[PDB]
Amino acid sequence: RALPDVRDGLKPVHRRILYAMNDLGMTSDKPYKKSARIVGEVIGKYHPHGDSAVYESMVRMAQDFNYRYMLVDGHGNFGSVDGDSAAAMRYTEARMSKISMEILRDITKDTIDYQDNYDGSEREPVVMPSRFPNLLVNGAAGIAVGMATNIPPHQLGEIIDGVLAVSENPDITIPELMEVIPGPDFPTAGQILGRSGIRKAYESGRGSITIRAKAEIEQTSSGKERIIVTELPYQVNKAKLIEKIADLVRDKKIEGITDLRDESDRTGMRIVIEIRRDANANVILNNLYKQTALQTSFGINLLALVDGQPKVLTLKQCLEHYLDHQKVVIRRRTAYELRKAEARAHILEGLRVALDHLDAVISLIRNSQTAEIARTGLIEQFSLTEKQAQAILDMRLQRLTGLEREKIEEEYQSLVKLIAELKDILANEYKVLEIIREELTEIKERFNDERRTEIVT
Amino acid sequence: SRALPDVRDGLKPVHRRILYAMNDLGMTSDKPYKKSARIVGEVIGKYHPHGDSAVYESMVRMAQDFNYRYMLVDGHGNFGSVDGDSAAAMRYTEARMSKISMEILRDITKDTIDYQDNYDGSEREPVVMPSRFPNLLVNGAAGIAVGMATNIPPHQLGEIIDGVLAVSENPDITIPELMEVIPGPDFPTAGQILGRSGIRKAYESGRGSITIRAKAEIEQTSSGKERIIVTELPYQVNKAKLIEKIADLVRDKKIEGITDLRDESDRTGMRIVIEIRRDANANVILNNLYKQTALQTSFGINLLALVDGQPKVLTLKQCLEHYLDHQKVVIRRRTAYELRKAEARAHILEGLRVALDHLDAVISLIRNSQTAEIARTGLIEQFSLTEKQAQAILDMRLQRLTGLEREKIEEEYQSLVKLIAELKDILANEYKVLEIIREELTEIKERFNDERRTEIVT
Ligand SMILES: [K+]
Ligand SMILES: [K+]
Numbered sequence: 001r002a003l004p005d006v007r008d009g010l011k012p013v014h015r016r017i018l019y020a021m022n023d024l025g026m027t028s029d030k031p032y033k034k035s036a037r038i039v040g041e042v043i044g045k046y047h048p049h050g051d052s053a054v055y056e057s058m059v060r061m062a063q064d065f066n067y068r069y070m071l072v073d074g075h076g077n078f079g080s081v082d083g084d085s086a087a088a089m090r091y092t093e094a095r096m097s098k099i100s101m102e103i104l105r106d107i108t109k110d111t112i113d114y115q116d117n118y119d120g121s122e123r124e125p126v127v128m129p130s131r132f133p134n135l136l137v138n139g140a141a142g143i144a145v146g147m148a149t150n151i152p153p154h155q156l157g158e159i160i161d162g163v164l165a166v167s168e169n170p171d172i173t174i175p176e177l178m179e180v181i182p183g184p185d186f187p188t189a190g191q192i193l194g195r196s197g198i199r200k201a202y203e204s205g206r207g208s209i210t211i212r213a214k215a216e217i218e219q220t221s222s223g224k225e226r227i228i229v230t231e232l233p234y235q236v237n238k239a240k241l242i243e244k245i246a247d248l249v250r251d252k253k254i255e256g257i258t259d260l261r262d263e264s265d266r267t268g269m270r271i272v273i274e275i276r277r278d279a280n281a282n283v284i285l286n287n288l289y290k291q292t293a294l295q296t297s298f299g300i301n302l303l304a305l306v307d308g309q310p311k312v313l314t315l316k317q318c319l320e321h322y323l324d325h326q327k328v329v330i331r332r333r334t335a336y337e338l339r340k341a342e343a344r345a346h347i348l349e350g351l352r353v354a355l356d357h358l359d360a361v362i363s364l365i366r367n368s369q370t371a372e373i374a375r376t377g378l379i380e381q382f383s384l385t386e387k388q389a390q391a392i393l394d395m396r397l398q399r400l401t402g403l404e405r406e407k408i409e410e411e412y413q414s415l416v417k418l419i420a421e422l423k424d425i426l427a428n429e430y431k432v433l434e435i436i437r438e439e440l441t442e443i444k445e446r447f448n449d450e451r452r453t454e455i456v457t
Numbered sequence: 458s459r460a461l462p463d464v465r466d467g468l469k470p471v472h473r474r475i476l477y478a479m480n481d482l483g484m485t486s487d488k489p490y491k492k493s494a495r496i497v498g499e500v501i502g503k504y505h506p507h508g509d510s511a512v513y514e515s516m517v518r519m520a521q522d523f524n525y526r527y528m529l530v531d532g533h534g535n536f537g538s539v540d541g542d543s544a545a546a547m548r549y550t551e552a553r554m555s556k557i558s559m560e561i562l563r564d565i566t567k568d569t570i571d572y573q574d575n576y577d578g579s580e581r582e583p584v585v586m587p588s589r590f591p592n593l594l595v596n597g598a599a600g601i602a603v604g605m606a607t608n609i610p611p612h613q614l615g616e617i618i619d620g621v622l623a624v625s626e627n628p629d630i631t632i633p634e635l636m637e638v639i640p641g642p643d644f645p646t647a648g649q650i651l652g653r654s655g656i657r658k659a660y661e662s663g664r665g666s667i668t669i670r671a672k673a674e675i676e677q678t679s680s681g682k683e684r685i686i687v688t689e690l691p692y693q694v695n696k697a698k699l700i701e702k703i704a705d706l707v708r709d710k711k712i713e714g715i716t717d718l719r720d721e722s723d724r725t726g727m728r729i730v731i732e733i734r735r736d737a738n739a740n741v742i743l744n745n746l747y748k749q750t751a752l753q754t755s756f757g758i759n760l761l762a763l764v765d766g767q768p769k770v771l772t773l774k775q776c777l778e779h780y781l782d783h784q785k786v787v788i789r790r791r792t793a794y795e796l797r798k799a800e801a802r803a804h805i806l807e808g809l810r811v812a813l814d815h816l817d818a819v820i821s822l823i824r825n826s827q828t829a830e831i832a833r834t835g836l837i838e839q840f841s842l843t844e845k846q847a848q849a850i851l852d853m854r855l856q857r858l859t860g861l862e863r864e865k866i867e868e869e870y871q872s873l874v875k876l877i878a879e880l881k882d883i884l885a886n887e888y889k890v891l892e893i894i895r896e897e898l899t900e901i902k903e904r905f906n907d908e909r910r911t912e913i914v915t
Binding site for chain 2: 358362365366367368369370371373374392393394395396397398400401402403404405
């Protein structure tokens with residue numbers, strides 16, 4: 001509906017793009033492939049809306065200034081903070097980022113339900129396993145005519161610790177939670193102005209906050225002062241802001257600005273505003289803050305798709321729905337692991353029946369004209385599956401060494417303890433909760449960076 | 458290195474690098490055309506760092522029907538024409554190997570040719586192709602290096618092969634005996650060679666001059682009007698600039714009697730029509746033309762190539778001989794490699810036959826062994842096997858023990874003993890090797906041969 005699912009935090013388009021990229025092998029390890037490919041694939045098979053929408057969607061997940069943790073690894077010009085747009089899809093290259101690899105984890109293991117695509121030809125997921133909490137981390141900035149969400153990004157470490165927090169204490173209160181998730185954290189750092197707007201948004205669902213650029217004031221040995229901006233409010237166009245300020249000084253609305261020069265580069269942003277040796281830098285800085293987009297309003301609205309219905313939600317509610325999602329995902333995946341494991345244990349019993357009547361099995365195979373004849377032979381003389389028989393036949397002779405037979409019994413017994421343990425994990429919810437904690441902690445310790453936005457009190 | 462062809466495969470270095478690079482990247486005769494830029498890039502980065510100009514124009518020349526007697530490169534796009542228009546930029550053309558150059562590369566995988574390091578010791582390029590048909594005589598060579606200039610003209614594939622076999626059978630064959638087989642050159646642009654004498658000097662000595670001539674014949678209108686029609690022109694002569702030259706020659710009034718000049722050349726081929734007023738004999742005018750323009754030209758033959766990396770001027774028979782020595786070397790190395798392979802696989806099979814033969818004992822030895830290491834030294838000492846064979850026995854899946862599989866092993870081993878036999882014999886008996894070369898070369902002739910285009914008038 002434009003609105004993201006609460007469980008994986010993806011609009012239709014993003015979920016499709018990702019799924020295709022992962023179908024077409026465009027993963028984090030594998031090399032890049034031309035955008036045009038992932039786009040046309042998606043257009044044809046899952047999301048029929050045009051190079052326009054699909055490409056721009058893909059691109060947006062590649063942009064470090066739009067995503068707190070970019071899902072799409074992009075190579076080439078995927079546009080910039082100054083507003084220039086990306087190069088044509090014939091000229092770019094793309095793949096899944098290391099982190100989105102987590103969004104797709106365990107999708108093979110029967111953890112999500114698939115549905116038919118537009119024409120009934122293929123299949124797409126209805127939700128990704130989404131092994132780290134994507135909605136709160138990366139956001140939702142989609143504004144449409146009926147319902148327009150606007151969920152700001154958050155430091156990944158924070159959100160994880162908060163989901164864990166709600167795990168251990170289901171009746172946490174919004175403020176107790178806020179000591180873990182102190183507020184948003186923009187891919188372009190800033191300063192958020194008040195704790196109040198944040199609190200209002202997390203408790204209620206909707207509410208407004210003030211984001212603000214990071215500007216210091218360097219001072220020369222002769223006491224001349226320069227203002228230097230190194231960060232801007234999430235989603236302000238640097239180029240348009242510079243033209244704006246330049247414009248005000250030209251109109252004579254701000255008095256005391258000498259030159260305004262952009263010195264940003266590979267080493268980072270650096271807008272430099274010069275001030276007459278007379279005027280008070282500070283003041284000028286505040287009148288900039290008030291006049292331009294060096295400081296702006298961000299309107300939070302926590303609206304998303306809860307079971308196919310647009311719902312506004314509180315911080316605790318988002319956390320909880322995500323955690324329910326992980327519970328299904330983990331229970332199911334462990335169903336899968338139980339199946340797998342039981343099956344391999346079956347084969348192992350076979351190889352043990354064999355290793356235990358080795359001589360007779362050997363005489364029987366060597367007195368068998370065909371492999372087929374031998375299989376039906378093993379079946380009938382030892383009470384085995386085709387599965388097991390063919391497993392015997394595929395056994396290299398060095399699997400008959402002492403230490404290898406020991407490694408078989410080792411593995412089999414070990415797999416017995418696993419079938420039983422998995423069975424239990426199905427049966428007891430606390431074990432499943434533990435799995436989520438362990439796995440989320442791995443993800444935190446692998447993908448966690450420092451917090452970019454300093455929230456001022 | 459040196460801008461001269463190697464006697465064995467007949468390529469300048471640059472050509473040999475373009476072909477090696479192409480075959481290496483899978484731009485073969487079957488597989489789809491690739492962007493020129495890709496092949497030129499690979500060549501410049503890897504083997505021949507001397508500009509996309511030289512490399513791509515080299516690649517272009519090998520693709521033109523009118524320069525190469527038997528085009529080595531299958532091109533696609535605008536590779537030009539005999540009108541002097543150059544090929545279009547490498548961003549605009551695609552290319553691949555031609556069906557005939559697949560023969561230039563045959564057997565290169567099988568240790569038939571040595572490699573050397575490339576210009577920065579990061580890659581390896583061959584020093585010489587296998588060259589399974591005589592490319593130096595067939596396609597020719599031209600160009601200067603270390604002062605000397607080489608100018609070998611193209612030939613008919615049928616003729617050169619028939620000669621190579623001729624030298625194979627009769628190693629004492631003489632240049633006029635040899636000539637009854639190879640009449641003379643055969644240019645891609647068809648037409649006339651005038652002297653049997655010129656050709657003879659050229660083949661017998663190494664250097665010689667030959668006289669090439671346009672194929673012009675005098676037609677007759679029902680009005681008693683005459684008109685010469687040129688359907689063929691001499692090798693390397695520019696059609697455009699000759700129409701030009703004749704325009705000026707008649708315009709300055711250097712030659713008179715000429716009435717009209719039209720280039721009716723089209724899809725059907727060349728038809729240059731020149732009109733004559735009834736006052737003048739078209740024959741005498743034709744002769745003035747041969748004399749004054751490029752309707753008749755001098756071709757300077759000089760059979761200069763690289764024998765062991767040294768420029769030498771060879772006589773026809775020495776060329777044929779040097780090519781035949783190369784191919785003899787090649788078949789010897791190839792069948793040596795095939796034998797290395799064979800002997801190896803048959804070794805392993807000998808191992809497996811030993812194991813199946815005493816099956817029980819081997820099984821029990823393995824299972825009374827603690828490690829694969831322990832088992833390996835076990836079998837080795839017990840049955841006199843190699844590590845290679847022992848390992849191979851340990852790697853044997855159990856279904857290999859079925860009857861049908863033991864039968865398959867015995868069959869492959871059989872086949873293989875037969876093949877090591879035949880191989881060792883080909884090696885020891887040079888007449889067998891010569892036989893191979895005759896068979897293979899005659900298959901190539903059977904598959905690629907065409908009609909002589911240049912008529913040797915006497
Ligand atoms: K403002
Ligand atoms: K002349």
